[PDB]
Amino acid sequence: GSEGSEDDPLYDEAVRFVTESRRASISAVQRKLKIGYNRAARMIEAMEMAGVVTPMNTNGSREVIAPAPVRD
């Protein structure tokens, strides 16, 4: 792993994207971040291990575990 482990030029954007979107979808991440599917997925993987996003669901939809910016 090189790009998308914990601190990546766009991971922070992805994590912020998922946290705010309340959903971890690579296609969506790449769409919102204007990144590549592979790149987004890599960062998304980082979200899984990092605890930013929960594993996929029975239907095939991820969730977010990392809190959102409420004030701090």
CATH value at residue 21: 1.10.10.10
In a domain, 25, yes or no: yes
Instruction: Give me the number of domains the chain comprises.
Output: 1
Does some domain include residue 70? no
Per the entry, the structure determination technique was NMR
Assess if residue 10 is contained within a domain. Answer: yes
Tokens of 23: 């959903």
Q: How far is residue 39 from each of residues 4, 25, 30, 34, 64, measured CA to CA in Å?
A: 7, 12, 8, 10, 19
**Apex 34 CA angle, 16 and 67, nearest 5:** 10
Place of tokens 């998922």: 18
Tokens at residue 38, please? 């592979």
